[PDB]
Structures are given as structure tokens and as C-alpha cells.
């Protein structure tokens, strides 16, 4: 009954493949259904098109600013920000999905992919969803980023939706 989306991934264009998330409705409802709306593109503005700004190796995927497409911009459905749900979830291994903020109750729409147990994320950011099919491209990706973070090609969500 939860809620499964994906992403098909390119690189410079050039598709790689599919990405597809359990998002853990069940104990994070508002959280789950941001970024489950945002990959419909339902509300009128969305992740489809946008891009991975920062990949660290070893650490995480982080994306879903797609509207300054640096890590500064995104908005939720809610409105630009909104509260931390709950942090029941953890962060306890490769393939969490997580919520990018700055500081509490500062949420939007971007996201991280962890690629590595971070335990010190804990209780600082809201965990979400997992990814279910696809953990290989989530590997694929991470080769693309470097010790600070810039990709050497261009990731974006060339397609995403709801399955």
C-alpha cells in the first residue's frame, strides 16, 4: 500500500537507467507524499528534468532542486518550507532516502540517496523512503561525482512518475 516511484536516470543526455523507491507512507505520510507528488509533476512543478547537483562517493546522491539547480532553490507542495514529521526512521544503510534541510523544520524538496550507512544524519534529517529496484544505477551514478561533490557529467531525471 505504499506508495512506489521512479526516476529514469541520463547522463549527459544519454539514459543509464531506473531508480525506483518504496516511500514509507505508512509512517511518514506528508513527507512520503511530497516527494511522491513532485515525481507525478501533479501539482504543476516537479522533479522531471532537474538534476543531481552534488554526488559524493562513498556518502550520498543529493538532488531535487529544480529551481536553481545548486543546492540553493526547490520548494515543497506545502509551500517553500516545511516541519520535520517525525525521525522514527534511520539512517541504516545504502539506499535510505532522506531529506536535505538547513536547519529544523526547513524541508523542501531536496533529497539524498545515502550510498553509505550515516548514522550522524539521525535525528537531523527525516528518512522516507528506500530504494526498492535499482541500486545498481544508484552505484552507476555515484562514479560520476568526486571528493567535493561536482559531477564530471550532467545527471538528471530525465523521466519520473508513479508505479
Same mark, same amino acid.
Given at each position: 500500500?505504499?506508495? /512506489?516511484?521512479?526516476?529514469?536516470? @541520463?547522463?549527459?543526455?544519454?539514459? #543509464? ?5 518504496? #516511500? ?7 513527507? @512520503? ?13 516537479? &522533479? !522531471? ?10 556518502? +550520498? ?5 529544480? /529551481? ?6 526547490? !520548494?515543497?507542495? &506545502? ?6 514529521? *517525525? ?9 535510505? #532516502?532522506?531529506?536535505? *534541510? @538547513?536547519?529544523? *523544520? /526547513? ?16 535525528? !537531523? ?10 541500486? *545498481?544505477?544508484?552505484?552507476? +551514478? ?8 561536482? /559531477?564530471?557529467? !550532467? ?7 508513479? #508505479?
Amino acid at each position: 500500500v505504499n506508495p /512506489t516511484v521512479f526516476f529514469d536516470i @541520463a547522463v549527459d543526455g544519454e539514459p #543509464l537507467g531506473r531508480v525506483s523507491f518504496e #516511500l514509507f507512507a505508512d509512517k511518514v505520510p506528508k513527507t @512520503a507524499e511530497n516527494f511522491r507528488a513532485l515525481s507525478t509533476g501533479e501539482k504543476g512543478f516537479g &522533479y !522531471k528534468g532537474s538534476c543531481f547537483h552534488r554526488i559524493i562517493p562513498g556518502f +550520498m546522491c543529493q538532488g531535487g532542486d529544480f /529551481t536553481r539547480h545548486n543546492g540553493t532553490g526547490g !520548494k515543497s507542495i &506545502y509551500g517553500e518550507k516545511f516541519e520535520d514529521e *517525525n525521525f522514527i526512521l534511520k539512517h541504516t544503510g545504502p539506499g535510505i #532516502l532522506s531529506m536535505a *534541510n @538547513a536547519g529544523p *523544520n /526547513t524541508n523542501g524538496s531536496q533529497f539524498f540517496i545515502c550510498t553509505a550507512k550515516t548514522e550522524w544524519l539521525d535525528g !537531523k534529517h527525516v528518512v522516507f523512503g528506500k530504494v526498492k529496484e535499482g541500486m *545498481n544505477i544508484v552505484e552507476a +551514478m555515484e562514479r560520476f561525482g568526486s571528493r567535493n561533490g561536482k /559531477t564530471s557529467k !550532467k545527471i538528471t531525471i530525465a523521466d519520473c512518475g508513479q #508505479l
